[PDB]
Nucleic acid binder design. Structure first.
Ligand SMILES: Nc1nc2c(ncn2[C@@H]2O[C@H](COP(=O)(O)OP(=O)(O)OP(=O)(O)O)[C@@H](O)[C@H]2O)c(=O)[nH]1
Ligand SMILES: Nc1nc2c(ncn2[C@@H]2O[C@H](COP(=O)(O)OP(=O)(O)OP(=O)(O)O)[C@@H](O)[C@H]2O)c(=O)[nH]1
Ligand SMILES: [Ca+2]
Ligand SMILES: [Ca+2]
Ligand SMILES: [Ca+2]
Ligand SMILES: [Ca+2]
Ligand SMILES: [Mg+2]
Ligand SMILES: [Mg+2]
Lengths: 897, 941
DNA sequence: TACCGTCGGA
RNA sequence: UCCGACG
DNA sequence: AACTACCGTCGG
RNA sequence: CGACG
């Protein structure tokens, strides 16, 4: 309680633009009758007054916190303050641009403030102040306004942000600015009318027509207003087709067959392409529209050019009138785009094996694939090392630097070589060095492969080229039969056969996470020309008793993606399983069903009652949301117990699958599940208080007895590790080495050159001896500071600074080339590198290459040039970074040779 | 004409006794030098003897160096064979990885008209690689020799009199075919000839029609009477042809048609695999029309097993398995498509009668080897051409509409291609990406193992643009780079206004195939792509539920473009990058397309709705009977043999008769060109491709393309008579106005081509070039003068340095003046020395400019490539200082390389990254990263 | 004054 | 442009 | 002390 | 880290 002054105080020193106030307050970095005064508001860069970029600042000052659909964000991080004298330390983050949302577009980003705060229901770090208290924290966040940068902030939403480092579990809480110093009673940022959270929520959800909803679920729908989305277009009432019924089963079971998905007209789809700047028209988008959320797919039957969209009951999360423009605006979160290979995750393996007709054969196949994959990998690197052009291509494919190059506009350099080992190899190879000839490169290439082996031991990867995660859609047009799916691609899906569609074959579909044996299903891919224009989506039938998506771990067509696999080896043994009869767990899982109406009865009728009920929902929902979550604990418990049983289909496996199936829906479903319910369910149905071990596959080595038997144990320890160990032993054998050597007669060329001049001139000899000596001093400082585990980059740079200081008559002017702004590009730099190489190449080779790699590459390129054999090119750092190896050149050139 | 016969006795270079020991590659390349340097190979004054070193040479320069020691050879050496070729000729038995070493010569008429002078001058070409063929694989590339020779029936004014005024044609033909020709130790006998078109005479020795003639080496000094290239067995041309054609079983064929099938043995192909007899299904009947017309519906195409397709992918290194290949297999020629019904794993192929061009037993393994000429591969956008436009207008439901559209399309296509280059020009990273996507240099880079240079810059203008931007030059700040981009665009505009190749995004040229499986109804076609076919608005992986136009070039009849319905059949989904026509109906759709079929024909396929939707199909034309003018010589091989009798001697004589008779037939003047041009002019002046004269001439040229294969005789008199009796007289029509570069007509253009070129293309091109010229910069760049400044300051305080600096200055103007004479002089534009040779001579003079510690420090003599020393930097800088405005082309072409070096040196900034000095080879293996260009620009904006 | 279209430069 | 195939 | 916190998809 | 299921 005495939680009475957590936020920074606002002084009357109170007329500053909101952006100016927050950035000035950001002083916190820490000064509390000094003559502080309001300097003369029109700044366009923060430096003029951990830094907000100017573009953000201009939009904050002049753009009303909005630009290109991006909103400036008032985000803050709160962490427990160490001192425990009679709580949190606020750290207002820099102003940043984040994608906007319905609520910020309708009321203004400046009126929204988001914080990351430690959960009060959490852990040793939690201060004793643990001895209380949660009600007091929740009251602090909800019951009252919060003053900050001259605005009164009220809380209206909370969501789990997960474990965060000050590690503890932190909540994201959202606040709305209801009033302020610049605010007006009953629009620019400064001239803002005062609006209560209760009205802001009533605008979004139209509570008067939704009091029948469980308030917990209603509260969860607030997330639609905060969904970060691209505003595409606004549609007119006569352009919106609200259906009053979903597509239902033809078998009369009553099941909804298009849960979450509707059609849009082809023109609407075109506007999406135009607004988002997309190479083609998207077949389907994940979006929001009024109360509706889910997927929209092009009506392949739309021949006109008129804009329209439909909604369905399964999509509309609350009764909406769709009157306000912002409730009629199509909002896209993502579009169905070109697919990539998915591989096979380990959760799928137990179910795949559980459903195999021949478990021994299915195991044998997965293992033979992995052995074939690892053997290919090891063999390809060995072949690549033989030729620089081939090794450059392999080194480029193993690690991606484009992100690092784009952010820097160049390959970043530490001292005389690029930061990364893979860039050091390519850079040095581009200058003519050979890994099989220059030991320095040989060693580097040895590290990377040795580190690559260590990455394989840690993580088991079964990669299947013929798999992909794909948005799921339902078949509005009735062309697909119950067990048929349609899959066409927007481009070539490449597997070392290639595909543009799937036709006349079986496929597996699943959703991750898969738990029940039926959470994977085998189906027949049939390409229907009627659907040819829908690409990068998989289309399920709308016939049959139950929608196929429902079978995929309770899936639907509202944004769900399916794992789709058409690898014939993985598919052919699979035997479908009926959906499981889920046990009754109500003894352990209590559902709070209280409706908004029931909440209101406590207060009466009319605006005053409704507003009270609304702030009630918020506080109660905050309590629920802050209750410790057990999804992860129970998921891990299931993994450990199913491992022990080697079963995913027996009685405890179904129980745990049903349990975790309800723990994901916890916020929307109002499911209560505390520590005591977990202890009771374990005691009565599982292994009681016993703490379960971790599966053996969770460590790098087989620490068990006898040969591994669990499929994941078998693949990681009986297939993968022995193969990896065989390559490592081959690599360890190195000892064997007509070999790679540090010495390169090319790199001493400048040294020998200047030695001949020095022998005939005393004046030049003195400069040479000085140079030789100063280099010696720096090599001793490298031994001192580099060979000292303050940080390693800093220490290398420290020597590099001393190295670059080694500086030098027509001879001096020709050596120094003063007109060059970058002294590392003059002839003295070459000479220094050559002389250092000559004197320290065998004693201390890393010093020479780390200090002078850059110039050694220059010397090498110069020396290996041959008259009339083409021209070496001197690339600028920027232009060098934008180039990549040409895969076709390597294959074509290698074939010729 | 025995005066011609006199000048036809010492045409080939003599093979001296001192070179008999030489391997053929030696004899060839040694002979080439003697011929190029004007030294007599039997000159006794030189004391010539075989150098034993030549037998082990791995570089031709090593052999020629020995000759250049002699004073007689000390003129620039002739173009040299690449080293891998030469080694292959010396130790590889003339074959490497499916490539054959080729022996070729070019002949031109001797300008000397002495009665005793050689009629022709010979230039042996350097050994080279070309793809092999069945005949070179079966008998060895070293036994084949091909020449280009002037056609003795040429009527050009340039023909000497000894032939033009004389029995000369009969004497030349007899020279070619009567007996063996001695050359490099071997006896060569002609066995095939084909038209090689109009060729300019070599400068070393007015276009003339030349023939390509192929000789087989029947024997030679090292040959053995009845393998390595040197130990070869005697073999007669008559026998080699019998091996190819199995003449005993083909005497029923017209001998001229039989002769034309020799091309199948010479077709350049990749040998894939050899199938066993039991894997080969010879069909006795083609797929026939279901309506009983007898018409063949799969003319030239058959099925292969899925495993055969896989082997093709493997052997050729393809990304995926190709649905269809163009190939040869024994006597069969045509297309083979994967059997979509094949689920086994057994190798097999099938042949049809329409594919088999002679009766072949398929016993020999070389007659059982699938050979691939080409595969159906990823498609690209096509465009219109001058032949389609009049037919598209003829068939248009609204001529005025289509006319106005085609034009407005040309206009918008020009605007997008100018607007994309103008945006890209604003940032160097973006222009580089645009230049890289503009052209393809991968092929050249892979062959030379680097970017080839001419003097101080890459040869390509595209490579030069990127090479100089890679060193930091901006194309909006340096005029030399702007000028290069300008010239490049002009050239493309010139091509548009000359060829009117209007781009149509939704169009492609696609191999045609027939539907073996009966799923396509008549007038339905199936098109699936192997990957996304992009068009700015829409992208495609297949075509479904739309109308398409299909056509073949040459298109002449109104019905040579056909509008049909694209229907995607899931049964055929695995056949990609081909267009499949129906095998139902009375006539195969392929036949309607200028008489086409499925043996390698490609169709122009258009699915652009604005172009498709106005088109109205025409019915097939009522063709005239032209037998009065086109006379087919149908003489069979059997009939030829009756002149001689039966048995092996008779057959051998008949075979050589076929050859000589077919040479005479092949050397007769061809009228395809004249009659096609006549049709163009007539249809132009009438502005009609559908009236009676248009149909007659379309039917005529339709017959003359088939000429050599059909035995059609059509002489000058018959052309005249044909024009007289059917076409209103033997006239000489005006050239269309669009043949000229500016509008020479009166008033507004009337013909659609005139309209598009002169009303649309020309004004728009001048408009774009006006706005492109306004969206763009100086020659000067202070950075490039940094070294020049640096050294004036030194040489302002040193007399010795100043003397050096002045000699450099003076000698640069010396070479500059030489550049203005050899390259700049418009007079030198035509000279025996071509542009590259003239540049190099100036470059050599430039590189000859050459510099005590200051000299050592400038020279860096330990560097093997003096062009990388600091001197080369000072030289380029000074030259730039002096001539950046007066002679920009000179500075950049001589010193561009070092200028690039100085620029990258000067623009480097401390701690702002490191410039990278790439090796020439490593530089050529890199390509722009499109994903980097887009990611970086987005961060910038 | 004697053709056009598709590919490729081993 | 030149050279080499092909339709 | 010692129990004990999930999978997948895209982007950055 | 940032969204999303
Ligand atoms: N305009 C023009 N068209 C040509 C030329 N050469 C071939 N063609 C085209 O090719 C056609 C003949 O095609 P081919 O497949 O080579 O021969 P074919 O008529 O099918 O006869 P076969 O070889 O027995 O199958 C005709 C023309 O349409 C040419 O030089 N000029
Ligand atoms: N393992 C795991 N699955 C999640 C998590 N969050 C969402 N899911 C998956 O998403 C499912 C919830 O689907 P949603 O699309 O978000 O909502 P819904 O269940 O369809 O309910 P509505 O919003 O009313 O349509 C459940 C899970 O299968 C998570 O944190 N962990
Ligand atoms: Ca869902
Ligand atoms: Ca749902
Ligand atoms: Ca043909
Ligand atoms: Ca044919
Ligand atoms: Mg659901
Ligand atoms: Mg034909």
């Amino acid at each position: 309680a005495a939680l009475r002054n957590i936020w920074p105080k606002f002084p009357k020193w109170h007329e500053a633009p909101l952006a100016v106030a927050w950035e000035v307050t950001r002083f916190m970095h820490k000064v509390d009758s000094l003559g502080l005064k309001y300097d003369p508001s029109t700044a366009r860069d923060v430096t003029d007054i951990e830094k907000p970029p100017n573009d953000v600042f201009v939009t904050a000052m002049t753009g009303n916190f909005e630009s290109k659909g991006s909103a400036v964000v008032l985000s803050a991080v709160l962490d427990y303050n160490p001192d425990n004298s009679p709580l949190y330390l606020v750290k207002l983050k820099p102003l940043m641009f984040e994608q906007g949302c319905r609520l910020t577009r309708r009321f203004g980003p400046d009126r929204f403030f988001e914080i990351l705060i430690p959960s009060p229901t959490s852990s040793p770090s939690v201060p004793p102040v643990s001895k209380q208290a949660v009600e007091e924290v929740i009251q602090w966040l909800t019951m009252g306004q919060h003053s900050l940068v001259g605005r009164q902030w009220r809380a209206f939403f909370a969501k789990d942000a997960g474990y965060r480092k000050p590690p503890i579990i932190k909540e994201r809480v959202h606040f709305f600015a209801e009033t302020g110093i610049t605010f007006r009673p009953d629009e620019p940022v400064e001239q803002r009318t005062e609006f209560k959270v209760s009205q802001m929520l009533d605008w979004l959800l139209q509570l008067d027509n939704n009091t029948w909803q469980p308030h917990l679920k209603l509260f969860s729908r607030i997330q639609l207003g905060l969904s970060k989305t691209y505003a595409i277009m606004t549609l007119e009432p006569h352009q919106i087709r609200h259906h009053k019924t979903d597509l239902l089963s033809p078998s009369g079971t009553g099941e909804v067959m298009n849960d979450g998905v509707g059609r849009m007209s082809r023109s609407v789809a075109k506007r999406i392409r135009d607004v988002l700047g997309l190479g083609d028209v998207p077949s389907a988008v994940q979006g929001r529209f009024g109360s509706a959320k889910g997927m929209w797919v092009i009506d392949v039957d739309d021949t006109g050019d008129e804009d329209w969209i439909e909604t369905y009951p399964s999509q509309r999360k609350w009764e909406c009138d769709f009157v306000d423009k912002h409730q009629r605006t199509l909002e896209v979160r993502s579009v169905a785009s070109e697919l990539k290979s998915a591989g096979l995750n380990l959760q799928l393996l137990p179910v795949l094996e559980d459903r195999a007709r021949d478990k021994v054969k299915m195991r044998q196949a997965i293992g033979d694939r992995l052995i074939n994959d690892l053997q290919r990998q090891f063999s390809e690197q060995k072949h690549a090392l033989n030729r620089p052009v081939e090794f450059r291509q392999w080194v480029y494919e193993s690690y991606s630097s484009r992100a690092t190059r784009v952010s820097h506009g160049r390959v970043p350099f530490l001292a005389g070589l690029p930061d990364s080992q893979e860039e050091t190899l390519n850079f040095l190879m581009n200058s003519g060095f050979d890994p099989k000839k220059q030991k320095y490169l040989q060693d580097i290439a040895w590290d990377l492969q040795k580190r690559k082996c260590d990455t394989l031991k840690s993580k088991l990867n079964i990669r299947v080229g013929r798999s992909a995660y794909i948005y799921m859609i339902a078949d509005f047009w009735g062309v697909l039969e119950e067990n048929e799916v349609h899959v066409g691609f927007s481009s070539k899906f490449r597997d070392e056969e290639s595909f543009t569609l799937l036709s006349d074959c079986d496929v597996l579909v699943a959703r991750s996470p898969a738990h029940f044996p039926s959470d994977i299903q085998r189906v027949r891919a049939v390409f229907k020309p009627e659907l040819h224009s829908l690409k990068d989506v998989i289309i399920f039938s709308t016939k049959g008793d139950v929608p196929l998506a429902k079978k995929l771990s309770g899936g639907d067509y509202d944004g769900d993606m399916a794992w789709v696999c058409w690898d014939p080896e993985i598919v052919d043994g699979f035997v479908n399983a009926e959906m499981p009869l889920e046990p009754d767990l109500s003894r352990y899982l209590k559902k709070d069903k209280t409706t908004f109406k029931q909440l209101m009865a406590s207060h009466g009728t009319g605006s005053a009652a409704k507003e009270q009920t609304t702030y009630d929902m918020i506080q109660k929902s905050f309590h629920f949301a802050l209750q410790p979550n057990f999804l992860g604990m129970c998921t891990n418990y299931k993994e450990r117990l199913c491992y022990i049983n080697n079963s995913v289909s027996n009685k405890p496996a179904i129980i745990l699958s049903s349990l975790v199936g309800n723990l994901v829906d916890q916020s929307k479903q109002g499911i209560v599940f505390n520590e005591a319910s977990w202890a009771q369910l374990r005691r009565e149905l599982l292994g009681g208080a016993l703490s379960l071990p971790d599966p053996m596959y969770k460590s790098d080595s087989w620490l068990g007895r006898g040969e591994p038997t669990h499929i994941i144990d078998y693949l990681k320890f009986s297939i993968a590790r022995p193969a990896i160990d065989k390559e490592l032993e081959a690599f360890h054998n190195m000892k064997a080495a007509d070999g790679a050597h540090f010495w390169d007669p090319d790199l001493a060329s400048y040294y020998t050159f200047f030695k001949e001049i020095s022998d005939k001139s005393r004046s030049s000899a003195l400069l040479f001896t000085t140079l030789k000596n100063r280099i010696g001093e720096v090599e001793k400082e490298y031994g001192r500071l580099v060979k000292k585990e303050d940080p390693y980059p800093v220490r290398v740079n420290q020597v590099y600074e001393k190295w670059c200081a080694i500086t030098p008559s027509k001879v001096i002017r020709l050596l120094e080339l003063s007109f060059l702004a970058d002294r590392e590009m003059n002839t003295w730099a070459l000479l220094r590198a050559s002389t250092a190489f000559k004197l320290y190449y065998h004693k201390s080779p890393k010093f020479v290459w780390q200090m002078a790699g850059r110039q050694l590459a220059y010397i090498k390129a110069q020396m290996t040039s041959r008259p009339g054999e083409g021209a070496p090119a001197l690339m600028t750092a920027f232009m060098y970074a934008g180039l990549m190896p040409d895969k076709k050149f390597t294959k074509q050139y290698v074939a010729r040779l």
